[PDB]
Symmetry: none
Subunit: 77 residues, 10 copies
């Protein structure tokens, strides 16, 4: 029993953007107050906890085009 | 018993955008107050917890076109 | 018993957008107050919890076109 | 017993939009107050809980065209 | 039983962006206050905890185009 | 014409209060938002204006007994 | 014409208070946002204006007994 | 015409307070945001203006008994 | 015409307070943000302006008893 | 015309306070941000301006009893 597998995907996609002028952005967060209480904490795996945070993020990219592509081939016998 | 598999998808997609002028954005969060109470915490897996947060995000991309593409081929015997 | 499988999908889709001028956006959240109480917490899987949050998000992309495409081929014997 | 399978879908769809001018958007949330009480919490699966939140989202994309396409081929013997 | 596997995906994708002028960005976070209490902490895995943080991030890239591509081939006998 | 005026009021009043125990008071205002617009403003007298305010007052006195007493004698000829 | 005026008011008032125990007071204002617009402002007298304020006052006196007493005698000829 | 004026008010008032124990007071203001706009400002008198303020006052006196007493005698001819 | 004026007020008032124990006071202001705009400012009198302030005051006196007393005698001819 | 004026007020007032123990005071201001804009400023009188300030005051006196007393006698002819 012969098994033949051909895996030749083709991609020619394009992801572009144009923006003539970009600016004049104001970000003025007005403070705040946060309080958290805990006693026991157990993390044993791929964990990404985030406890008691006060964050401000100003994200202004001229591009920001995102492309994700995943290929997977599994063979079992 | 011979098995033949051909896997040749073709992609020529395009994802574009045009924006002549972009700006004059005002973000003024007015504070706040948050309180959380816990005692026991057990995370053992692919967890993404987020406890007691006060966040402000200003996200202004000139592009921001997103493309996700996944291929998968599983063979069992 | 010979088995022949041909998998050649074709895609030429396009997802575009045009916007001559974009701006003059005001975001003024007026604070707030949130309180949460818990004692026992067990997360063991692909969990995405989010407890006790006060968030403001200003999302202004000039593009923002999203395309998701998934292919899957499973063979069993 | 020979089995022949041909899988060649064709797509040439387009999803576009035009907007000459876009702006002058005001978002003024007037605060609030939320309180939640719990003691036992067990999440063991693909869960997406969200407990005790006060959120404001201002989403203004110049594009925002969304396209989702999924292909699946299952073979059993 | 001979097994032949051909794995020749082709990629010619492009991810570009143009932005004529970009600037005039103001980020003025107004302080804050955060307090966290815990006693026991056990992390034994790929953990990425983050406890009690007050962060401000100003992220302004002229490019910022992101591309992620993963290939995987598993053979079992 | 002789005029005789005798002005001898007598006061022995008492204003007391007793409170054995006083406490456990919670004041949690949930933010808000107020906007006022004006152009011309003229105040020329004993004025006590108050324009565009967002106030929270927590007033807990153990005493708080108030006594006001005014005497006035006017003579004309 | 002889005029005789006697002005001998008597006061023996008392204003007291007792409070055995006083405490456990929580004041947690949740932020806010206020905006005022004006162009012309003229104050020429005993004025006590207050424009565009965001105030929190926690007033806890153990006493706080207030007494106001005014005497006035006017003679004209 | 002889004029005789006798002005002998008597005061023996007392203003006291007792408080056995006083404490455990929490004041946690959660930020905020205030904006004021003006162009012309003229104050020529006993004025007490206060423009664009964000204040927090924690006033805890063990006493705090206030007494105001004013005497006035005006003679005209 | 002889004029006789006798001005002998008597005061024996007392203003006291007792507080056995006083403490455990927490003051935690959570920041904020204030902005004021003006161009013309004219103050020519007993003025007490206060423009664009962010203040926190923690006032804890063990005493704090206040007494104000004013006498005035005006004679005209 | 002889004029006789006798001005002999008597004061024996007392203003006291007792506080057995006083302490354990925490003052933790969480920053902030204030901005003021002006161009013309004219002060010609008894003025007490205060522009663009960020102040924290911790005032803890063991005494703090205040007494104000003013006498005035005006004679005209």
């Amino acid at each position: 029993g012969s098994v033949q597998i051909v895996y030749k995907p083709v991609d020619l996609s394009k992801v572009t953007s144009k923006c003539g002028s970009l600016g004049n952005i104001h970000h003025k967060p007005g403070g705040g107050q946060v309080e958290v209480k805990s006693e026991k904490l157990d993390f044993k795996d791929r964990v990404q906890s985030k406890i008691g945070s006060l964050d401000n993020i100003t994200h202004v990219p001229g591009g920001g085009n995102k492309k994700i592509e995943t290929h997977k081939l599994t063979f079992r016998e």
